[PDB]
């Protein structure tokens, strides 16, 4: 139901400063007023993070995705190797009602999108869906920025989330906020690349990559991570 889009929108691939954002709870253990050193996959402090104002992007090991979107134009995600019916693929859609997670051999066109009519209903992301393996439905997720961390380890797809009101215009705020664990999925896909879905009428988001390194985390009395320190940035660190 979708064809090649002539209007090749250009989102300038700028670089900006990661600051000290992208910290998530690494396990499911309560700790109070203790300083814990842990080695795991994180986003290194003060790094170049890509800013777009729908290109194909590599998945690498994990992905930190953020968007200070208003009116919720961001829709969903596509994951896999070739994004075709020839290979097992994964799809996330977050429409007005319950979010839908799908794992099938979906076939998409060159430019998958949702589109809206003004009556607000249109869906032409893919073309065919022949062989399915997993299905799931949950509660919908959603001046305000939304951050997600995607990891895929041992046939387990882990999503961590956090949304926070914002007042700054362009760059990422220079604050700290841990990311609580949102969902785990027991499905194994050799994801190598991914994509994004928008809501067009009938656009700025940030992307960063993870690396293995060692961090030090400080827990408060109630077990909420309140600050963290990198162990390979500066001699003081």
């Amino acid at each position: 139901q979708c064809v090649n889009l002539t209007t090749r929108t250009q989102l300038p691939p700028a670089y900006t400063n990661s600051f000290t954002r992208g910290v998530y709870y690494p396990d499911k253990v309560f700790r109070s007023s203790v300083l814990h050193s842990t080695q795991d996959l994180f986003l290194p402090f003060f790094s170049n993070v890509t800013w777009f104002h729908n290109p194909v992007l590599p998945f690498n090991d994990g992905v930190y995705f953020a968007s200070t979107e208003k009116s919720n134009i961001i829709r969903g995600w596509i994951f896999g190797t070739t994004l075709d019916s020839k290979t097992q693929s994964l799809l996330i859609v977050n429409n007005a009602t319950n979010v839908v997670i799908k794992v099938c051999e979906f076939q998409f066109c060159n430019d998958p999108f949702l589109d809206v009519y003004y009556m607000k209903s249109e869906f032409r992301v893919y073309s065919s869906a022949n062989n399915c393996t997993f299905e799931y439905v949950s509660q919908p997720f959603l001046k305000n920025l939304r951050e997600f961390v995607f990891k895929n380890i041992d046939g387990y797809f882990k999503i961590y989330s956090k949304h926070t009101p914002i007042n700054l215009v362009r760059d990422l705020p220079q604050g700290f906020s841990a990311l609580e664990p949102l969902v785990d999925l027991p499905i194994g896909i050799n994801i190598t690349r991914f994509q994004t879905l928008l809501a067009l009428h009938r656009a700025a988001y940030y992307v960063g990559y993870l690396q293995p390194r060692t961090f030090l985390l400080k827990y408060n009395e109630n077990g909420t991570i309140t600050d963290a320190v990198d162990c390979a940035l500066d001699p003081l660190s």
């Binding site: 253990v29 309560f30 109630n222």
Partner: protein, 366 residues
């Protein structure tokens, strides 16, 4: 045992160390979350209509908790036949994506559904692998799948060019050439239809009545398993040295109420050096503490076997409640060093000769 440790037949005045007292666990408890997400087997077992033997209903099952005990004790079903997996151990074994193949056949041919079995519909309609890991459940449905005028709505494959591979579903309806001339869609010589209707009647005897038959196939591939039994749990006890298996986290100790405020997604906690301190029961969803059962050495206070013969016993660092031949003895005294049996507490004060600890000591008078 004081003499035995000293390896002497005479013992001098003092206090001597001996074996270590330790409390032992009493019983065991296990806790698992509320058994929910019961697997939808009624939709395939109590369905109004089943499909034909050549077009058997195939269903996939995943992400569910399967209760096989009810079917195990189900007296309505007559055939509960299988050898690959023991019927009573299904709840223990855990699999993923169980397959259900259901249909209605004749009573006489129910034997044809078996590994390494041949017949009329076994090799033509539904074939089973020789290494089948599943179980076939069949039961009479004469009162439901038959008509007093004759049930002609069920058909079976009779003529095929070749046999049927295991786990194959062929629904092709094409004319069969039994000779050396093409049929060209004509029921001429050496031309027979592959499908023949069943003639179920209520008055038909045993073996001619319609039997509903469904096979369950268990598979376990590299992806994590998700379909298996309910994992029954015991009840909860407190203030007793027991051992526990809280949601797979197992260990010994004694549990009490706690006031910690877990953030809504954790399950347990620890302080330092990997020592669990609190847990959350997966049913009540409340925080409980854990402390190890009491232990500590024991000591013997004696005035010297030359002078007298009676002794006193000290359990150091032990609350004077789990005291237990000397379980009662004399009046029992509780001090910051532990619990003392065989001595009398007084209100006087003299010089110290046999130091006990925490600023107190004992002497012989009793």
């Amino acid at each position: 045992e004081t003499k035995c440790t000293l390896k002497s037949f005479t013992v001098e005045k003092g206090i001597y160390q001996t074996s270590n007292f330790r409390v032992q666990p009493t019983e065991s408890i296990v806790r698992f979350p509320n058994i929910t997400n019961l697997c939808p087997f009624g939709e395939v077992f109590n369905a109004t209509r089943f499909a034909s033997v050549y077009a058997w209903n195939r269903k996939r099952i995943s992400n569910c908790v399967a209760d096989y005990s009810v079917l195990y004790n189900s007296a309505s079903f007559s055939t509960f036949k299988c050898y690959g997996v023991s019927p009573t151990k299904l709840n223990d074994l855990c699999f993923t994506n169980v397959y259900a193949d259901s249909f209605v056949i004749r009573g006489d041919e129910v034997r044809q559904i078996a590994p390494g079995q041949t017949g009329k519909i076994a090799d033509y309609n539904y074939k089973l692998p020789d290494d089948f890991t599943g179980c076939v459940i069949a039961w009479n449905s004469n009162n439901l799948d038959s008509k007093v005028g004759g049930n002609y709505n069920y058909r079976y494959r009779l003529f095929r060019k070749s046999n049927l591979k295991p786990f194959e579903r062929d629904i092709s309806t094409e004319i069969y050439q039994a000779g050396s001339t093409p049929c060209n869609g004509v029921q001429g010589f050496n031309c027979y239809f592959p499908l023949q209707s069943y003639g179920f009647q209520p008055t038909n005897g045993v073996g001619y009545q319609p039997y509903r038959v469904v096979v369950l196939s268990f598979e376990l591939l590299h992806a994590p398993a998700t379909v298996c039994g309910p994992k029954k749990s015991t009840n909860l006890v407190k203030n007793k040295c027991v051992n526990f298996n809280f949601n797979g986290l197992t260990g010994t100790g004694v549990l009490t109420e706690s006031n910690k405020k877990f953030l809504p997604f954790q399950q347990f906690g620890r302080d330092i050096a990997d020592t669990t301190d609190a847990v959350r029961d997966p049913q009540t969803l409340e925080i409980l503490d854990i402390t190890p059962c009491s232990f500590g050495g024991v000591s013997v206070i004696t005035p010297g076997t030359n002078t007298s013969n009676q002794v006193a016993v000290l359990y150091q660092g032990v609350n004077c409640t789990e005291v237990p031949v000397y379980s009662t003895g004399s009046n029992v005294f509780q001090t910051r060093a532990g619990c003392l049996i065989g001595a009398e507490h007084v209100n006087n004060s003299y010089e110290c000769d046999i130091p006990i600890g925490a600023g107190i000591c004992a002497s012989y008078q009793s």
